[PDB]
Enzyme design. Structure first.
Site, PDB file in Angstrom:
ATOM      1  N   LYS B  85       0.835  -1.185   0.000  1.00 22.97           N
ATOM      2  CA  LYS B  85       0.000   0.000   0.000  1.00 22.97           C
ATOM      3  C   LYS B  85       0.872   1.238   0.000  1.00 22.97           C
ATOM      4  CE  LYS B  85      -3.536   2.413   2.414  1.00 22.97           C
ATOM      5  NZ  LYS B  85      -4.315   2.551   1.188  1.00 22.97           N
ATOM      6  N   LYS B 109       3.869   1.347  10.240  1.00 26.34           N
ATOM      7  CA  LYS B 109       2.582   1.861  10.679  1.00 26.34           C
ATOM      8  C   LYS B 109       1.522   0.783  10.587  1.00 26.34           C
ATOM      9  CE  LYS B 109       1.465   6.020   9.591  1.00 26.34           C
ATOM     10  NZ  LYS B 109       0.988   7.186   8.828  1.00 26.34           N
ATOM     11  N   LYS B 121       4.909   3.861  -1.424  1.00 31.85           N
ATOM     12  CA  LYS B 121       4.491   5.228  -1.651  1.00 31.85           C
ATOM     13  C   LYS B 121       5.022   5.682  -2.990  1.00 31.85           C
ATOM     14  CE  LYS B 121       4.404   9.859   0.105  1.00 31.85           C
ATOM     15  NZ  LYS B 121       2.935   9.980   0.055  1.00 31.85           N
ATOM     16  N   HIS B 190     -12.050  -3.601  -9.117  1.00 29.14           N
ATOM     17  CA  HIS B 190     -12.720  -2.604  -8.292  1.00 29.14           C
ATOM     18  C   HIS B 190     -11.975  -2.367  -6.988  1.00 29.14           C
ATOM     19  CE1 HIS B 190     -16.166  -2.505 -10.985  1.00 29.14           C
ATOM     20  NE2 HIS B 190     -16.063  -3.819 -11.058  1.00 29.14           N
ATOM     21  N   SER B 208     -13.606  11.623   7.798  1.00 30.13           N
ATOM     22  CA  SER B 208     -13.386  11.858   9.214  1.00 30.13           C
ATOM     23  C   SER B 208     -12.591  10.750   9.874  1.00 30.13           C
ATOM     24  CB  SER B 208     -14.719  11.992   9.938  1.00 30.13           C
ATOM     25  OG  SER B 208     -15.360  10.733  10.018  1.00 30.13           O
TER      26      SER B 208
HETATM   27  N1  LIG Z   1     -19.379  15.942  11.305  1.00 30.24           N
HETATM   28  C1  LIG Z   1     -18.848  16.565  10.260  1.00 30.24           C
HETATM   29  N2  LIG Z   1     -18.809  15.944   9.030  1.00 30.24           N
HETATM   30  C2  LIG Z   1     -18.273  16.583   7.964  1.00 30.24           C
HETATM   31  C3  LIG Z   1     -17.759  17.860   8.099  1.00 30.24           C
HETATM   32  N3  LIG Z   1     -17.289  18.260   6.898  1.00 30.24           N
HETATM   33  C4  LIG Z   1     -17.495  17.265   6.010  1.00 30.24           C
HETATM   34  N4  LIG Z   1     -18.096  16.221   6.659  1.00 30.24           N
HETATM   35  C5  LIG Z   1     -18.496  14.941   6.066  1.00 30.24           C
HETATM   36  O1  LIG Z   1     -19.801  14.636   6.501  1.00 30.24           O
HETATM   37  C6  LIG Z   1     -19.864  13.306   6.964  1.00 30.24           C
HETATM   38  C7  LIG Z   1     -20.782  13.261   8.165  1.00 30.24           C
HETATM   39  O2  LIG Z   1     -20.743  11.972   8.718  1.00 30.24           O
HETATM   40  P1  LIG Z   1     -22.124  11.272   9.102  1.00 30.24           P
HETATM   41  O3  LIG Z   1     -22.132   9.877   8.549  1.00 30.24           O
HETATM   42  O4  LIG Z   1     -23.280  12.068   8.558  1.00 30.24           O
HETATM   43  O5  LIG Z   1     -22.137  11.243  10.711  1.00 30.24           O
HETATM   44  P2  LIG Z   1     -21.076  10.393  11.574  1.00 30.24           P
HETATM   45  O6  LIG Z   1     -20.215   9.577  10.650  1.00 30.24           O
HETATM   46  O7  LIG Z   1     -21.795   9.519  12.567  1.00 30.24           O
HETATM   47  O8  LIG Z   1     -20.141  11.450  12.346  1.00 30.24           O
HETATM   48  P3  LIG Z   1     -19.657  12.813  11.655  1.00 30.24           P
HETATM   49  O9  LIG Z   1     -18.802  12.477  10.463  1.00 30.24           O
HETATM   50  O10 LIG Z   1     -18.833  13.605  12.637  1.00 30.24           O
HETATM   51  O11 LIG Z   1     -20.852  13.645  11.265  1.00 30.24           O
HETATM   52  C8  LIG Z   1     -18.457  12.899   7.346  1.00 30.24           C
HETATM   53  O12 LIG Z   1     -18.199  11.575   6.953  1.00 30.24           O
HETATM   54  C9  LIG Z   1     -17.575  13.835   6.557  1.00 30.24           C
HETATM   55  O13 LIG Z   1     -17.035  13.123   5.472  1.00 30.24           O
HETATM   56  C10 LIG Z   1     -17.794  18.484   9.332  1.00 30.24           C
HETATM   57  O14 LIG Z   1     -17.342  19.618   9.448  1.00 30.24           O
HETATM   58  N5  LIG Z   1     -18.343  17.835  10.412  1.00 30.24           N
END
Ligand SMILES: Nc1nc2c(ncn2[C@@H]2O[C@H](COP(=O)(O)OP(=O)(O)OP(=O)(O)O)[C@@H](O)[C@H]2O)c(=O)[nH]1
Ligand SMILES: Nc1nc2c(ncn2[C@@H]2O[C@H](COP(=O)(O)OP(=O)(O)OP(=O)(O)O)[C@@H](O)[C@H]2O)c(=O)[nH]1
Ligand SMILES: Nc1nc2c(ncn2[C@@H]2O[C@H](COP(=O)(O)OP(=O)(O)OP(=O)(O)O)[C@@H](O)[C@H]2O)c(=O)[nH]1
Lengths: 496, 496, 496
Positions: B85, B109, B121, B190, B208
């Protein structure tokens, strides 16, 4: 009497016009409104046609020593998302055009239910009945011998499947050919096809699948008051008039499952006639005569009903078999709140309008008869994960499923089991039945319903978004396209 | 200011010396102490270097009609455990040496978190900003057109991935190329890459992920008294001072999740400045300005804090973005019990010593920013099992998850429901929220945490085994090597 | 004005009827006359149709940013003998039916000349002129990107080639695509196509090939008295009236070679008009104006001849370009002993009869314009043997070619060089020219003629066998089928 192709093409066109209005608005590219509008517009010119369409010719030798040539067609709608799926149809109504539809159809069918597959289909200008088993076994294993030479059959290109005029034998024949021509080591050859018998990797449940897919599909709406209110009906099945046309397969396995949850089915339509019993009919008793008589007529507990099923006063109506059965002549004559459309194109475009004018809800052929696809998908995995589902987990879950109860028992006996009173927490007959009945049958029944559940919900949303009310047929073709479009857009639309 | 390479190489060396002392003792071969010691010693000469390193040259045509040559590097650390990877990085700081590190890094890692992948990489001497979208789409799909000719890209050789300066588009471009050059039938195409958009097989949660991976990583320690005691701190998050530097990505999605479980974050560091509010800041309100202002400064409920975030009096400190931000000049100036190090090499070797002298705990960059790898692994399976996780099981579990309760109900109503008193056992709002919110989002959130959980625990052990106390950075590089070594040893170390 | 398809199909049918009469008699199987007759009869039902026919759809992006869909057809007549060959044609007259002919044609064309290849052809609904070079380079390299995914392009499946509306560029584009999508290591990728430029493995001579193939084809008959007698003509070219219609390519390179061996060409037909000089015209001088004027008209040494070339009083007539130029209205009006038919279907079926009634000999389009195929075959080997022909041998032969003469010299000087008289045996200017001019140009010129030589001779035989006299068109379609049939019979006709 348009060609079922022209029916389809007519629909997609309509959906596109509907979608574009916003799809351009919700496109997040740095461009000009016009510029981007010329992006979407053409994309909806791109997916619509079917990319690959192959025409064949077979030098087969009959049993009588004679030779004859045979034409065979395979249509692989779109590569936007492989692999591709499509059943086979042996008939003499076949034609290039007749195919492109059904491939370009199954695609949209699959998307509604969130399936990766891409639509395809094949056919052959032939009438099986005039040929033996051997001949057919000479035809097929040669058919899929060519297509394999030409990359239209493989567990990750194109997956044949059954259909009317076919069965497990046909599939079973194919898979062997492939393993003897291509795989030779490839592990995934056991996934070359679907609908296989059970002994090779098939499924406990395929035959009745479709019928079920109808059922849970209806359920996700009948239990939805938001539309009950519109039709002045009631949620649930415990008080409703149900009927059927196209007895046999999908007509039946649904009727039965339907009977299970408080339904009361009243009639049956058959190619040869009909019956009627406002007292409700046991599907079981009918299952008997279908085998003890090869027909419904002569059923003791139902009168031979004169007229078409469609004109029966009921709540639901299921045109499971007949095609183009609903016309402007009958659309007003129908007596029903809802239609199912298990079969493909049992209903005419003109009728749909009439129903919307009669406030009659309906269901799109896509959604319901999808389950016959969904299940396959599952079966296509059984042959990839090389296991029967769950066998690594049933007993583990089981253990946990009653270590907990013990914990409860102890927890309670601990607090207010003061004197020592024992709480013999035990499963329920049902719950115990699940356990000892642990088997794929239960998994699939689940991963099917959930699918049909989620899908419907998306559709309702899709309807509200576009204020289509009860005109779901479009709404589905709508919800499909957005997914499809969204795919082809995020795929680097093309490397040219 | 050593080269990040030299940083890395400097670490591994140290770990080896530490490991060997016992690794020779715990080697179960029939040999001489000396003899076997010469086995391990050299093995720790073998894995350290990166096996394959390729240098490229691209004849690309600009939009202006001109041509220009482009250099591109791919480094595949070690074949001891394929696939491999590595993300891609478009920049002008690129160089052969700069790569071998990060590949030889990601490997270690991955091992910490018990991932099969092998580190790799790639990079390119280029500045995207000076080039269009089209050009980049001409660069990339040619980049991965060569590497594919040369076995550095395939679902079971080498898996590209995103990184700063990249995004889904870039990935999406690649995968298409591969399918149009290599796969052509191969189902696993895929999986050629990861970080894909959601419509093709991506994930609900990637963006996130990293931020989360930080969080659960901290949690596995803050809730560990064994180290709270050392730092004179308290378990939990309900009473602690939190801060951040490197707002945007990983700085943020952690800050938010961090805020969720009783945290009180106080400050924010940004490339342009800082803020400060001992009253605690809502990440949400900040999310707004980052889009409504493109900056933190001007935030009503925080003063523009003068000075670097590092010098803030707090409990936690998160150098999420800046590299080499912590020096001997600041190491004593820092005011904190713990450091996170989301970014790679935000901290200097010299500082680490100073902290250990200041009794300051820290966290290794490996562990935390791993989650951005972990998740991918999952996403790399979604594209192999060809399903969204669980869809075969959610409703099944669901069913069982409330057939049980019924059983409880009946069980109780049976014993001391004597008079017939009914116990309407029901889910909880939360538990019901899980159910209706059934989706990958929940699975991944789980298979991520568990990972980061188990890993940490191994590390604690590893620390105790070697009496490293708080010098975890080594301890990780330690726990990694033993796994790696153990692998390469049990692989028939070489067939030559 | 039947469709060129219907023309073809009409011919084969006729040939079959002719063949069968004896083909059943010369079949050496232990069966019943009837039984075996039902073998051959159907086989001549089997080869006639084209096995594989694929229809495509291309999402290409224009230069203006717009998208548009493009249809493309590939037809692979028969697998009885792979690989398969076929050029490409960009036009808007394209259609499925229009293809199957030309594939089912080239097959029979190839067999006449004893070539392994199997007939195929492709086309696209498009007009190049409305598109740029880039676009076409976007179209093509995508066209052969799909077909390759689907096994219609490979050095041992299917070999594209040029045709009107195409050129080396088009080919050159393709081959690169293939090497970047399929070969990746495969050595034979350099044979993916034919008609390549010279720098990659092309040929010194392709452009004029066809024109030559016409010439040696005529020669094998004009020098044949057996037919001179019939037409009351004389062998040789030293005294004959020659003309042409379809100046440019094949019209020209033949005219020139024709001029070389004692010919006297008189006229020229061009899309814009005609000329006439009973004194004979230098092709060279014409080559000039075709470039200095883009037309023939205005040629000093020829009058602008009023009327069609066909009505000129001559000995030979060459409809090199015009299609369906010869009709019942002109067939009697023609003034000629022989016709060539360089182009495909310049002549109508009805006319052929008229000629046979006018005792007018003709030549089938198959035989003559074959050389444009033959040469390719050679070029398809240059890219497999990975050498320019002969380079291992020229000088070796050379050495021997004059060690001998020395031997002669010595041998003579030995016997009646008694006094010592020396015999300075030396090459001839010509023979010395061959030597120093050693190059593929000479090989191909040979392996071409020999081919066209042997073929004709087989045909004469075939004619005598069936007493067709001058009705060669059939006779060729005859000699072809027997070869084809013979192949498909000895191939284990089918494994089904
Ligand atoms: N929470 C949050 N999500 C964001 C933000 N900006 C972009 N996102 C996108 O929005 C998605 C929101 O996730 P959700 O599936 O709706 O809720 P969650 O995964 O339970 O938790 P959060 O990601 O924090 O909202 C995230 O996966 C991010 O990719 C942000 O500022 N805050
Ligand atoms: N129930 C039912 N099954 C039939 C009938 N005819 C054939 N079958 C087959 O018998 C199988 C019975 O399925 P089971 O697994 O035993 O029971 P089930 O799946 O829980 O539900 P049913 O299919 O309705 O019986 C089905 O999968 C069908 O393939 C029929 O008339 N009724
Ligand atoms: N002779 C000739 N060659 C042409 C003409 N136009 C283009 N050519 C090209 O020039 C090449 C000349 O061929 P050469 O190898 O030099 O000579 P050659 O093959 O012995 O015979 P020619 O082709 O007739 O000249 C041919 O292969 C053609 O491809 C033309 O008008 N006359």
């Amino acid at each position: 009497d348009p060609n079922f192709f022209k029916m389809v093409e007519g629909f997609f066109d309509r959906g596109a016009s509907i979608v574009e209005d916003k799809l351009v608005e919700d496109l997040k590219t740095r461009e000009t409104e016009e510029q981007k509008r010329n992006r979407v517009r053409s994309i909806l010119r791109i997916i619509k046609p079917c990319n690959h369409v192959l025409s064949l010719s077979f030098p087969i030798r009959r049993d009588d020593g004679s030779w004859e040539v045979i034409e065979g067609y395979r249509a692989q709608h779109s590569q936007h998302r492989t692999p591709c799926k499509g059943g086979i149809r042996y008939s003499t109504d076949v034609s290039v055009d007749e195919v492109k539809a059904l491939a370009s159809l199954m695609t949209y069918k699959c998307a509604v239910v969130d399936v990766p597959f891409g639509g395809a289909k094949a056919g052959v200008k032939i009438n099986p009945k005039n040929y033996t088993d051997n001949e057919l076994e000479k035809i097929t294993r040669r058919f899929t011998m060519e297509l394999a030479k030409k990359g239209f059959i493989g567990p990750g290109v194109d997956v044949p499947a059954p259909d009317m005029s076919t069965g497990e034998r046909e599939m079973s024949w194919i898979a062997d050919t492939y393993a003897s021509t291509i795989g030779h080591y490839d592990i995934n050859a056991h996934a070359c096809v679907t609908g296989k018998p059970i002994s090779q990797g098939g499924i406990h449940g395929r035959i009745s699948a479709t019928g079920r897919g109808v059922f849970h599909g209806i359920e996700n709406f009948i239990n939805e008051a938001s539309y009950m209110s519109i039709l002045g009906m009631t949620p649930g099945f415990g008080d409703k008039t149900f009927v059927v046309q196209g007895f046999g397969n999908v007509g039946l396995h649904s009727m039965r499952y339907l009977h299970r949850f408080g339904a009361k089915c009243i009639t049956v339509g058959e190619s040869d006639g009909s019956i009627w019993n406002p007292d409700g009919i046991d599907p079981k008793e009918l299952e008997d005569f279908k085998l003890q008589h090869g027909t419904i007529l002569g059923f003791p507990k139902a009168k031979i009903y004169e007229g078409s099923i469609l004109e029966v006063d009921c709540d639901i109506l299921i045109p499971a078999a007949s095609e183009k059965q609903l016309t402007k002549s009958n659309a007003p004559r129908v007596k029903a709140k809802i239609i199912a459309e298990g079969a493909n194109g049992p209903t005419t475009p003109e009728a749909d309008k009439i129903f919307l004018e009669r406030n009659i809800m309906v269901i799109p052929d896509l959604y319901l008869n999808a389950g016959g696809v969904t299940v396959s998908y599952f079966e296509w995995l059984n042959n990839l994960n090389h296991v029967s589902y769950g066998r690594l987990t049933f007993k583990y879950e089981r253990d946990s499923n009653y270590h907990l109860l013990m914990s409860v028992q102890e927890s309670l006996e601990r607090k207010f089991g003061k004197h020592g009173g024992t709480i013999p927490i035990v499963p329920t007959a049902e719950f115990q039945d699940r356990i000892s009945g642990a088997s794929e049958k239960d998994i699939v029944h689940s991963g099917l319903a959930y699918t049909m559940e989620r899908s419907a919900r998306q559709i309702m949303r899709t309807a509200m978004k576009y204020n289509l009310g009860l005109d779901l047929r479009t709404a589905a073709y709508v919800n499909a396209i957005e997914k499809v479009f969204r795919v082809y857009n995020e795929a680097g639309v093309t490397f040219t």
